[PDB]
């Protein structure tokens, strides 16, 4: 992901 | 001097104070936090659970739980701790020295207020107590004797028409649709941009985002087209780690769920139709007086431009010869408490408490006979 978690 | 305590004790934010003031003394989120790790450092703050602002400050290493859900207490071992922290840590006053004025949403399980009375009398030994409906206190704070209150509480929305001080208990409407549901909806729709918020410490950040950037649209389709055609409606927010997010179209889609529960997969109708139906439930000869005295309340009606949307919707619904006037004071976030500080301070009210000996005689079921 972009915010929260990686991906 | 000795005066009754007024404890709002909402679903998302506990507000307590002394009667006879114009502002709550203590305001803090009604959450309980417990650590989910194991300390390794000797002597450094090893305690069972944090409550209130202390839990918000240390929310990184705790799991936060709300005791009240949809206006209903679902964990009494935590509600007791909330009230204990209110009495001995926030107000810092003995509980058995002042009467208490609690609030409860209408159309609620009788067991809720029965257990409220039992806790207030058996545990804290208050000499007197009372459980008033929130919308009635909001109307008292507004400073009038007729109108329809629409308390969009954070945990629960409800409308209670009142005429000349005669509440109509057959036109009251309750809708379990409020700030926490909008927070969850924002968490669900933020994933489209790519931001993933799962844990409760992140739900707090999402609430801080909602409470700051979200706003209600005067016309939904128009705003959607505007946000799609031009990147002039996006806002930037900095998470508490340095990351920066930019939310656009989402801004007015979160509060739009209030007017369209179909987004949240509910069969219910928007708050505008709820208020209109609660008005049409009344007898005709008073409806006009309600149309011109619609009052908002609760922290979920603080969204910018909600008065305009509500007025437009109701004007479209109601006939074209009635004057609609959405009374929205800029202090609505505390109206439910403010009216309390009024009601507990009146001189014609001191004979309506639930005395301790009345309870000792008639059991906790006396709340149904004394409190309306």
């Amino acid at each position: 992901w972009x915010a929260x978690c990686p991906a | 001097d000795i005066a009754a305590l007024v404890v709002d004790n909402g679903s998302g934010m506990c507000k307590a104070g002394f009667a006879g003031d114009d502002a709550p003394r203590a305001v803090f989120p009604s959450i309980v936090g417990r650590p989910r790790h194991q300390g390794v450092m000797v002597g450094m703050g090893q305690k069972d659970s944090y409550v209130g602002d202390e839990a918000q400050s240390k929310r990184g290493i705790l799991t936060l739980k709300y005791p009240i859900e949809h206006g209903i207490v679902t964990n009494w071992d935590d509600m007791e701790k909330i009230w204990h922290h209110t009495f001995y840590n926030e107000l810092r006053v003995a509980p058995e020295e002042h009467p208490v004025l609690l609030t409860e949403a209408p159309l609620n399980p009788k067991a809720n207020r029965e257990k409220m009375t039992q806790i207030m009398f058996e545990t804290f030994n208050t000499p007197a107590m009372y459980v008033a409906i929130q919308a009635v206190l909001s109307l008292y704070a507004s400073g009038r004797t007729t109108g329809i209150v629409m308390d969009s509480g954070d945990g629960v929305t409800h409308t209670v028409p009142i005429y000349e001080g005669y509440a109509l208990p057959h036109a009251i409407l309750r809708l379990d649709l409020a700030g926490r549901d909008l927070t969850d909806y924002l968490m669900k729709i933020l994933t489209e941009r790519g931001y993933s918020f799962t844990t409760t410490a992140e739900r707090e950040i999402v609430r801080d985002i909602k409470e700051k950037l979200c706003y209600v649209a005067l016309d939904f389709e128009q705003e959607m087209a505007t946000a799609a055609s031009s990147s002039s409606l996006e806002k930037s927010y900095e998470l508490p780690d340095g990351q920066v997010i930019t939310i656009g179209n989402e801004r007015f889609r979160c509060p739009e769920a209030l007017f369209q529960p179909s987004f949240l997969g509910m069969e219910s109708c928007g708050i505008h139709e709820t208020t209109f139906n609660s008005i049409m439930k009344c007898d005709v000869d008073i409806r006009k007086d309600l149309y011109a005295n619609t009052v908002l309340s609760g922290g979920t009606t603080m969204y910018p431009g909600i008065a305009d949307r509500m007025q437009k919707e109701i004007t479209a619904l109601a006939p074209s010869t009635m004057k609609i006037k959405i009374i929205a004071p800029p202090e609505r976030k505390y109206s439910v408490w403010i009216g309390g500080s009024i009601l507990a301070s009146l001189s014609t009210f001191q004979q309506m408490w639930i005395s301790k000996q009345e309870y000792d005689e008639s059991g906790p079921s006396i709340v149904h006979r004394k409190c309306f």
Partner: protein
């Protein structure tokens, strides 16, 4: 241990030891063991007239008369077969195991011998389960004096079985904590989607106890279970009988463990206050390093 168990350990131990001694072929030795149980029950395992080959297990109960009523021995007979004999003088029920005619698989008869009190109770209780299963309204409703100052009023209807415990504790501390432990007993139905309707009352007795001699008073609490045909069917009535049987003893047990629970929190708070006092002792300038035992260091 959270839930009290229904099988007695002394009976099982003694009978298993006797059966191991008999199965190995050793000569039988004497046995005379008297003991007790919950609710003032008195057990006695002995030999009839010094006959070291027979072991008689007798039990004296408090619901003396309710078990002598006609039909109150169907379950006892059904479960114990030929072991059920005439009661020993002074006792109420009596089993008799012949150490020379013991069938194979000696575990089952000992498992059913440790539940003698539970079976005497379930025998006087399944009467109303059947009165409700057979579709008859207004069947006999009684008061089992399962203790000496407390009662259990049982009633069987066309569609339900009502059990009203009239209960009172002996000690003052136990009374004060039991008021809480019984007030908070309706908050249990939030732990399961299927739990019998429980009603608590200590202002006034229910309307079931107005034609009967169940113990009433201003110091007694009344707890009403409404067991529906999903708790009294022929497949889930064993658990229901076990729970209705051990309810009062379980409440007493947990009332007496609440104190040993609170003592730990009180020790914690005592230490927390000692830590606040410790701010008064002026920190020493130099301490002499000692050993695990406490003697001088004996080195740098």
């Amino acid at each position: 241990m959270i839930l009290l168990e229904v099988n007695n350990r002394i009976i099982e131990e003694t009978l298993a030891l006797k059966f191991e001694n008999a199965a190995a072929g050793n000569k039988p030795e004497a046995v005379e063991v008297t003991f007790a149980d919950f609710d003032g029950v008195l057990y006695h395992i002995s030999n009839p007239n010094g006959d070291k080959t027979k072991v008689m297990v007798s039990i004296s109960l408090k619901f003396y008369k309710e078990l002598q009523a006609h039909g109150a021995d169907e379950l006892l007979k059904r479960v114990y077969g030929s072991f059920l004999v005439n009661p020993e003088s002074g006792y109420n029920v009596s089993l008799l195991y012949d150490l020379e005619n013991l069938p194979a698989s000696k575990d089952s008869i000992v498992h059913q011998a440790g539940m003698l009190k539970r079976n005497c109770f379930a025998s006087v209780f399944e009467k109303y389960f059947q009165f409700q299963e057979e579709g008859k309204e207004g069947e006999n409703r009684a008061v089992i004096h399962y203790r000496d100052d407390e009662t259990m009023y049982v009633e069987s209807k066309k569609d339900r079985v009502t059990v009203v415990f009239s209960t009172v504790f002996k000690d003052d501390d136990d009374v004060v904590i039991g008021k809480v432990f019984m007030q908070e007993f309706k908050e249990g139905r939030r732990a399961s989607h299927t739990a019998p309707q429980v009603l608590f009352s200590h202002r006034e007795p229910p309307l079931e106890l107005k034609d009967t001699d169940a113990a009433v008073g201003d110091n007694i609490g009344y707890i009403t279970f409404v067991l529906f045909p999903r708790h009294t069917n022929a497949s889930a009535r064993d658990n229901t009988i076990n729970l209705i049987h051990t309810f009062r003893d379980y409440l007493h047990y947990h009332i007496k463990c609440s104190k040993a629970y609170i003592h730990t929190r009180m020790r914690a708070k005592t230490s927390d206050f000692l830590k606040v006092l410790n701010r008064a002792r002026p920190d020493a300038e130099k301490k002499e390093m000692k050993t695990i035992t406490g003697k001088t260091f004996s080195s740098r």
